[PDB]
RNA sequence: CGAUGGCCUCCGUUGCCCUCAGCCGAUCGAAAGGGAGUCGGGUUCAGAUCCCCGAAUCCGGAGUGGCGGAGAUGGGCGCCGCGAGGCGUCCAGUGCGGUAACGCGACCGAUCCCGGAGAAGCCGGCGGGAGCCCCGGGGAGAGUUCUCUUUUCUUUGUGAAGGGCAGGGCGCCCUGGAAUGGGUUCGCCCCGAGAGAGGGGCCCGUGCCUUGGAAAGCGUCGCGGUUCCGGCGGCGUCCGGUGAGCUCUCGCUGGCCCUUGAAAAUCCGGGGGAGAGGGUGUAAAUCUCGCGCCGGGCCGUACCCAUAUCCGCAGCAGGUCUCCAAGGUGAACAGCCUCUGGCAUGUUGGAACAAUGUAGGUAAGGGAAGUCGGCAAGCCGGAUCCGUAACUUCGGGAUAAGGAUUGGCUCUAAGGGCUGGCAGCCGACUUAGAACUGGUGCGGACCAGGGGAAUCCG
């Protein structure tokens, strides 16, 4: 596993060929982003809330997303 | 304070082999647990590894030597009559 | 700082063979505070009875698990442990349930 | 040199010539030696590091290398343009930083040569880190409640692989030059061949945090499928402290040797500098850097592993190599009792309690008179405080011999850490002394040396 810790490079590992789903795992204080691709599965954590759902629709649109409720 | 009276190193033998072998092996054992001056370095750590084997602790070099002192009486009256054989032989 | 918890008989009391009077004066004899059971060691912690709701009321540290003691005791010595049992429905709560 | 294929470009495939050069000898020999790389959760009637789920990782391969990044893009001159920036000539460019230990994401290079790792005994002491045990609390669920008990018991977590930080070690570096010698260990040991004192660097970091990771696991309470369900829900998985404690592991240091305590496979670094790239760019050769693509064939895998799966003719009181190891007492992995786990008394039961047996005990008075012979049994026995002879190879004899004490309960005194001659706050077992007290009993079970004087032999 990787932690990616800026914004913009967990958006370019997403857009990547490689990469196969997003999965978005909400507790309380933290919100994880989880992209799994070939090697490590990436995660990028958010601390609050409105970055997470401004975010929600950034990923493009061909890449599965998986809310785990 | 003194622990034994007349018997040093070889205390460690109790009351076995018989003291003329005990005191026989007094000496010896003293001489090869001794440490020495570094002849190089001047440091007193000129300590035995194995027979013949006599290895400095910081000067790092090891010298070929007698089985239990560092010097041998034979070796040293040798090296002095090689030195005046080798003065003598070219003048 | 508030520690604040209540217990629960109302099954049994509706059901009819106990009442939450005994249970009060239970309580306030043998509540001991720095273990003294003297008269709740003062006004330090406080009981007040609702219906069929005992509320205990203090500031000093005090156990969830010292009042579910003392509630089984008195389930003890009134004859209705193999009937009634004593559980949590979340914090701060205990409640008496049949089997 | 000769031929072929692929856009015959550039390379591959050969066939011949030139040139280059050791083998320690084919080959076999370890399911405990060396030997890259997989962990967690779930699942069966019987298999799991192998199946499923999820996270990784090693090795090998690839015409066009799939891609990024590095090699890399600067300076001079004549210019244009107010400048910004843009033209035309030359020149460089196989990386950069730190005084140094060394650091940074890579940072060309052959035959050859050097070195390292693999690759090392036994014992002692100490320190660090885990697991376990222990103490004080918060929860959750159970047990007792005739009286008492804020009570007693169970449970209360995070993998590999990355990143960061503690914490350990350094025979690593820089400044400076020390006697009134200093630093320092349980012991040692260290220093003008550079100590103390400052400031750095490196290695291991199995510990903590984080990514994994709460989504899973577990403990409880409640609803479902009336079932065939990795069913669905709520809550919780918390805060601390100590220890010459035990086990494992890492490290430092010392002792012993007329004992010095493996080899090879495999891998890596360095010295050299034969070669290759391009003429200023679409830069090239080349990359042990990041990501991406493909594959990993063959054999074993069930179970027993022992008072019933092995060998003794057998379900034979024999024999047969190992790892894990709780609480109390206690020096103790001793003996005795208990918890987790296991078992049904060892190839039969019932009723009687004669003799003689086998195995345990106790005996008045005497105390070896028994017997070949104190055979057997019995006495002593731990610990603390006194005391300890002849002889001696001076080390021993020696626990010599011989004495006194030992319970319970209530106290006193002494022995330490952290924070701000003092004050406050924490604390772990010890040692000594005293009083009181019991039908003189106190190493109360268990554990647990009888002694002395001589002769012979070794
Ligand atoms: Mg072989
Ligand atoms: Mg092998
Ligand atoms: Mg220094
Ligand atoms: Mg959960
Ligand atoms: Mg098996
Ligand atoms: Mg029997
Ligand atoms: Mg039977
Ligand atoms: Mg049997
Ligand atoms: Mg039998
Ligand atoms: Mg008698
Ligand atoms: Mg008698
Ligand atoms: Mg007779
Ligand atoms: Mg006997
Ligand atoms: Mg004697
Ligand atoms: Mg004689
Ligand atoms: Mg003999
Ligand atoms: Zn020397």
Redesign the pocket.
Do not use: I, W
């Given at each position: 596993?990787?932690?990616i810790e800026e914004i913009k490079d967990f958006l370019l590992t997403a857009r990547?060929?490689?990469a196969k789903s997003v999965?978005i795992?909400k507790?309380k204080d933290?919100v994880?982003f989880?992209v799994?691709?070939?090697?490590?599965?990436y995660?990028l954590?958010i601390t609050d809330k409105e970055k997470a759902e401004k975010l929600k629709q950034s990923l493009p649109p061909g890449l599965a997303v998986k809310e785990?409720? | 304070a003194k622990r034994?009276?007349?018997?040093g190193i070889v205390?460690k033998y109790?009351?076995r082999y018989?003291?003329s072998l005990?005191?026989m092996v007094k000496k010896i054992?003293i001489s090869?647990?001794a440490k020495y001056t570094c002849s190089?370095?001047?440091?007193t750590?000129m300590?035995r590894?194995?027979?013949g084997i006599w290895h400095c602790?910081?000067?790092?070099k090891t010298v070929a030597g007698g089985?239990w002192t560092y010097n041998t009486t034979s070796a040293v009256t040798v090296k002095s009559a090689i030195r005046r054989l080798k003065e003598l032989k070219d003048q | 700082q508030l520690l604040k918890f209540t217990l629960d008989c109302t099954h049994p009391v509706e059901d009819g063979i106990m009442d939450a009077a005994n249970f009060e004066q239970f309580l306030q004899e043998?509540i001991?505070?720095?273990?003294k059971?003297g008269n709740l060691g003062g006004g330090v912690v406080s009981l007040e009875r609702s219906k069929s709701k005992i509320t205990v009321t203090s500031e000093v540290?005090?156990?969830?698990?010292?009042l579910?003691?003392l509630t089984?005791?008195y389930?003890?010595?009134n004859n209705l442990?193999d009937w009634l049992?004593?559980?949590?429905?979340?914090?701060e709560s205990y409640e008496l349930?049949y089997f």
């Open positions: 596993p990787r932690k990547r060929k490689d999965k795992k507790n933290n994880k989880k799994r691709c070939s090697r490590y599965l995660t954590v785990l409720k | 034994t009276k007349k018997v205390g109790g009351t018989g003291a005990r005191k054992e090869q647990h190089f370095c001047g440091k750590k300590k590894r194995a027979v602790g910081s000067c790092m089985a | 043998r001991k505070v720095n273990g059971a540290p005090f156990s969830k698990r010292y579910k003691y089984k005791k389930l003890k010595k442990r049992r004593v559980v949590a429905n979340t914090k349930r």
